[PDB]
Symmetry: C3
Subunit: 483 residues, 3 copies
């Protein structure tokens, strides 16, 4: 009659690496690294993105003629631009603090367009119907930005323009305007009469005077002149004043909006779908609770940390090795016993030891995952061609964090997997000793983690040994007789 | 007669977490996380902060009428502003490179105010007594900044102003001035006569021409005009030249100062007290050598790393479990023996093993703490409303470091605590074996980590076993007789 | 007859630290920290640096008279400036976006100088031979920048200047020019006639008007006036237009170049040598595959992480302690046996166990090193005196990463070294047990990890025990007789 202590085995072919040994096949493991996405752009915090299918942000906020088709949302959690979103400014010039605006508009709680300076009543002394150009065509017709009015001299006169808006909203108002810069003096006079024109704009924390910069420039979109764009936020209760003798492109519409924390802009040709996520990647939303991902470095949301590793498999089970080896027949648990006597034979798991190991290892896996506790962040940032130093500083931060997370994540798995297997080996060894301590002189050790009895051990005996209730004295005399 | 190997126990109710098991009660532990402060703002490097109780930095450096009460320090290690420090610029306008100045003044080795352009001798052709406004009242009277002079036309004439200062100090000089921008032409003429006025200021590495920007603006502090503020540092040996035909607010006082490395600004209503610290937090100074703190993300000094964890308890002792369990009576050490014979009974610690474990664990704790080796840094940074991209870059850095430190700190405690307990278990087991190896056949194992002798073992025997000097052969014959 | 299980020892005197115990002497260890360099500046990616021995970048790109001796490379991987590279701008003024230019030129795939506006044909109406100054002397003669032409009125007339360049290159063109600012009106007229002069420059994404700012300034290099420098890149297919009535210093030469990713600038007096490296440090190139270095925080290339630790020794071997202690005579392996009988005595390594431990530990060391997987980065960044906030942000990033890497690197070695020694102890103990399991009752344990036989064990017996093929029953009767 024999009783053996062994461990579980199966047909599992996946592996883990350990710091000491590579390609260790295990019976069970979990994945800490998410390498998949659903291929769709989803809502964040239950709120849809603003999708600019053809237009970029400058185009959309200014009212490029091609953005008219776009339905504006009252709110959004992030902005999506496509790889071919070319419809930005249609009248060539510099959009000032464009990048800062792009970021401020990245996430809004609310957004309403309203007509700040009504076309039919605000500009009675100026011609608001000649403000068109071939650079901003609509269905082949000369046109202009929808949210701006380009005023032209009326009756060969451009009287001082003096208008203001008082922000009676409970929210900040975004006001945009522009300055026109004719290619020649002749154009300056044709449009504004005054020649030596100036523009002044200001609010309680903003004040700037502008002058026309008249020179011939290389043609862009068939324009030898330029039009710059400016913007400011007006605090609730404040006033914005526009004073000009020419070259001012006045706001028509302005936006009442409340900035929501902050998010980012995703550039992707990936479609928007009615789905929910907590982590939005340019390649598609990520749906996981795992601490790491290797899909993309730039994500918006409470995202897993980006690592450049390809495989972070955390062992939970023991080595799968078909004690000489494991028992593929012991399907009911990790550790257990096999017995053979004159009544019968077979396998049975040691439920106390097995469940103990399961609870401790499961909690261990949960510790690694639960402690990541990520924060909601935009990650991606945008800089212009004269901001390379800061762009590269941002890169240092992303590369530094990547190397830290990759190094620590890859080692952590390697530090954990080695012991996990030693832990299981220890538990198996401990079962062997627990039996040895009971059998004492009533059985001999025969190798392979097995004991051979010096007495007949029936089913009620094998159970006594497994349950830790074996009566040594009871079988002592028989054992003496057989030695 | 018996001899048992056991371990210490007490009435301690605190716990540690391990990566495998939560809420493990231990006999001894240490705290790696500082969650308290003394509630006071203290000196850094033995040097007091500059406390601006009512004024902010712009107010203080310009000489806002309400800062007159403030006693200026000759030096400071950091600057403290209160939550209601509203007295900044009193004459509305833009303070240029204000944020850069705020940071440069954050820490100074020395700071002296001196009268760079004496009021009674530097401006003989201009009226220095009319430079007042209702926007900067003093005790109800019209007044102005104390460190600046606003010059007005004298006798309906504003002759070219031409003054310079040569820096004969061994330290850099901070010179501040401003440009006035009247709301109307009529005011420009009332104050400066010339109408088409200009201002020029320059040093060896600085040169800028300014022109009045005259337009009506929204009233701020009852002013329809604005006054901008500018500043520059003058290197030792250099000269600063002020040339103007109007609209120049000239320096009266300038500051000779030496910038000390760099620190930061704390915004807090917490009072300044005569105390010392090496880490200043907005909520109160931190007094600890521990590697982590969870008090606040923004601190100045050689501060513990901020983590968002709440509990980093590092086990030093063994499991406190009242071998079946621990011995609450073994008060003299972690590991030890209990004996009982016909002479007496009781507990005694194994001093060699216990001290060994103490030295190794104590050194281990010190390793975790000592290796943090922090640096002196300001941490907090300030950006304006047109600098959101860089402000958010700074945020990424702080959030990234927080997640890294929190994740690693929480795991480190969990990686350490699990083994610390296994280490103690190993030492206890080793004592059991050391005894087993001596007693051999002269005693039997009876469970609970205890041996039962087959011979009479007197006090001089029990000591021989504990001391590793047990004479097996000596008691062999008696043991044979009793088997 | 005896057989002992022991371990290797030698005369090695180096140590490792462990988290539990300091100064542990080991038989073998490796260094993870590189603290040496070859003292020379080497090529990166097979490409030489651009070495500016006397000139700085502004000097070199503008053509300071002292840079004429310098041979320009067609390409470079990084730029080297010396500690005394004072020859920058020779005509005092502000070089605009200088820092951004310095970084863009840090690494170029190709770089060709060409004469964008030929001196003899582009400026027929202006005097190109009077553009000299005492501020930019050459061999004692008045001179000027080599890549720029300072045009002066010809025949007391300065007719409108109108020239343009079309970029017919497949690469970006860097065009530099400057604006002159005379100290007095009299000089403005002496040089340009027009007095109220202006300069306009523009490209498809750039447009700026400049005006002379005429005022007397402190003398720098005997100049009471100033000359500012501007630059822009012209995209392939675009045009740059220069329109002026005076005060324009026109480009003579321009550079056709392609920016290569990005690198940095090293300031060092260390010479350039014909050698190769993958990591360039200001103190000399680093030649190692190790994960960490403590040479310098600022490096260019696929560099080891900078740590401020001094010693990262990773144990590979076992404790070197001349089982009571190690065997200095067992030179053929880490673990092994010693035997003595009537035939002979001596040592022999256990090759199976020793090689197993070597392969696992060697792979372990390689795991720590191989997983660092660094990226190519410049690390160093440059900011001006009005950019302290961003400079200090960059510092936070470097200090934060340093503390993270130092803390983790120092602990990692301490976490690893402790167990490495326990691992070896476990393997030695396991050999002891493997022997014990065979000998059973045919030998006694005598301490020191040794067994003493109860029978005569010849050379063919000692080999049977070591090889795991000992026949217990064979010697059982003799063992009985001797007990
Ligand atoms: C909107 O974007 C399209 C491009 O997506 C612009 O059309 C291009 O205009 C340039 C200049 O006339 C032509 O050289 C290209 O061949 C046109 N491309 C296509 C596909 O038609 C269009 O002009 C933009 N409209 C506005 C108002 O900005
Ligand atoms: C995304 O999450 C939001 C909750 O934040 C879901 O909104 C709920 O939708 C159900 C209808 O299915 C309504 O009865 C609930 O009242 C809504 N909750 C709130 C707070 O408004 C939304 O449906 C989810 N979207 C998807 C695609 O699953
Ligand atoms: C100093 O700060 C106080 C506020 O702390 C200023 O007083 C306020 O002035 C505004 C404008 O006149 C009033 O609407 C507020 O009601 C005043 N508040 C209080 C509490 O009096 C004061 O004018 C500032 N003085 C200077 C020189 O800047
Ligand atoms: C803060 O630390 C400084 C030392 O950096 C203490 O200054 C010393 O004060 C004693 C009087 O108690 C003098 O006798 C010493 O000469 C001072 N040392 C130096 C270098 O000047 C200071 O007292 C400490 N402050 C507090 C509140 O403890
Ligand atoms: C090139 O750099 C040298 C310094 O390395 C300049 O020479 C200095 O010029 C100043 C001003 O005339 C003198 O006060 C110094 O004494 C000179 N130093 C030396 C060592 O001669 C030189 O003028 C620069 N040349 C150019 C074209 O920039
Ligand atoms: C630095 O590395 C480059 C390769 O990137 C070496 O260039 C080779 O030099 C040999 C002559 O010794 C030529 O036969 C090969 O054709 C070159 N390879 C290439 C791709 O051009 C260079 O010699 C190395 N420099 C040093 C000092 O070792
Ligand atoms: C082989 O592996 C698969 C997947 O785990 C499992 O469903 C199947 O039952 C295994 N076959 C055997 C004989 O265990
Ligand atoms: C197996 O181990 C070897 C190293 O001996 C390694 O190169 C290989 O990639 C591992 N196997 C896989 C991915 O199957
Ligand atoms: C995938 O998304 C669904 C719906 O929100 C969620 O129930 C499921 O748990 C997510 N999968 C994972 C791995 O989190
Ligand atoms: C196992 O042992 C426990 C005592 O610890 C006893 O109560 C239980 O009945 C035993 N199980 C069996 C099947 O006898
Ligand atoms: C209970 O715990 C306290 C605090 O450690 C200690 O002072 C006291 O002596 C303990 N009581 C007993 C009976 O051990
Ligand atoms: C005890 O463990 C449970 C998990 O089983 C955990 O939720 C709880 O917070 C722990 N206890 C405390 C703080 O007392
Ligand atoms: C608290 O401050 C005092 C005085 O400087 C110092 O002696 C004490 O050690 C500090 N406490 C800690 C935990 O460092
Ligand atoms: C303990 O053993 C040492 C020898 O290692 C001996 O010198 C010492 O006297 C012994 N202690 C007692 C109390 O006998
Ligand atoms: C002493 O150490 C050196 C360096 O490792 C070695 O070459 C030499 O053989 C050693 N001497 C002895 C006797 O082992
Ligand atoms: C040896 O250990 C001590 C601590 O007990 C430490 O101070 C010393 O620096 C270590 N030794 C060296 C560098 O030899
Ligand atoms: C030093 O450089 C040489 C030549 O490139 C290389 O063969 C050698 O392996 C390098 N040394 C180290 C430690 O990498
Ligand atoms: C060692 O044992 C193996 C069997 O595992 C056997 O084949 C080999 O011949 C033995 N070595 C010697 C020297 O007998």
């Amino acid at each position: 009659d024999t009783l053996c202590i062994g461990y579980h085995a199966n047909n599992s072919t996946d592996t883990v690496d350990t710091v000491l040994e590579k390609n260790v096949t295990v019976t069970h493991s979990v994945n800490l690294l998410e390498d998949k996405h659903n291929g769709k752009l989803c809502k964040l915090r239950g709120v849809a993105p603003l999708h600019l299918g053809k237009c970029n942000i400058a185009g959309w906020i200014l009212g490029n003629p091609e953005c008219e088709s776009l339905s504006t949302a009252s709110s959004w959690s992030y902005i999506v631009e496509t790889s071919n979103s070319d419809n930005g400014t249609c009248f060539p010039g510099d959009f000032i603090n464009y990048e800062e605006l792009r970021e401020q508009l990245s996430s809004v709680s609310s957004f309403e367009r309203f007509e700040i300076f009504p076309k039919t009543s605000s500009w009675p002394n100026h011609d608001s119907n000649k403000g068109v150009t071939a650079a901003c065509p609509h269905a082949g017709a000369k046109s202009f930005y929808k949210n701006l009015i380009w005023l032209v001299k009326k009756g060969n006169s451009y009287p001082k323009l003096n208008q203001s808006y008082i922000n009676d909203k409970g929210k900040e108002v975004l006001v945009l305007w522009g300055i026109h810069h004719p290619s020649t003096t002749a154009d300056q006079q044709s449009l504004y009469q005054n020649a030596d024109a100036y523009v002044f704009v200001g609010t309680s924390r903003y004040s700037k005077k502008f002058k026309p910069e008249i020179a011939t420039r290389p043609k862009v979109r068939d324009q030898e002149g330029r039009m710059n764009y400016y913007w400011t936020l007006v605090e609730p209760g404040d006033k914005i004043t526009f004073e000009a003798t020419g070259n001012l492109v006045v706001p028509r519409y302005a936006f009442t909006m409340e900035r929501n924390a902050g998010s980012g802009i995703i550039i992707s040709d990936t479609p928007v779908h009615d789905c929910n996520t907590t982590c939005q990647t340019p390649e598609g939303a990520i749906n996981t609770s795992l601490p790491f991902q290797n899909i993309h470095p730039i994500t918006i949301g409470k995202c897993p940390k980006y690592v450049k590793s390809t495989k972070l498999r955390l062992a939970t089970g023991l080595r799968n090795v078909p004690i000489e080896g494991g028992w593929t027949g012991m399907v009911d648990g990790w550790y257990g016993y096999h017995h053979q006597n004159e009544q019968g034979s077979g396998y049975a798991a040691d439920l106390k030891s097995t469940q103990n190991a399961i609870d401790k290892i499961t909690n261990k896996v949960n510790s690694v995952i639960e402690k990541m506790n990520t924060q909601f962040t935009a990650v991606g940032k945008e800089f212009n061609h004269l901001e390379k130093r800061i762009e590269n500083l941002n890169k240092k931060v992303d590369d530094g964090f990547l190397d830290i997370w990759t190094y620590n994540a890859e080692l952590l798995v390697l530090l954990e997997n080695e012991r996990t297997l030693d832990y299981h080996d220890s538990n198996v060894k401990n079962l062997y000793e627990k039996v040895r301590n009971q059998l004492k002189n009533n059985a001999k050790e025969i190798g392979n983690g097995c004991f051979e009895f010096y007495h007949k051990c029936d089913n009620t005996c094998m159970e006594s040994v497994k349950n830790g209730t074996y009566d040594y004295p009871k079988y002592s005399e028989e054992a003496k007789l057989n030695r």
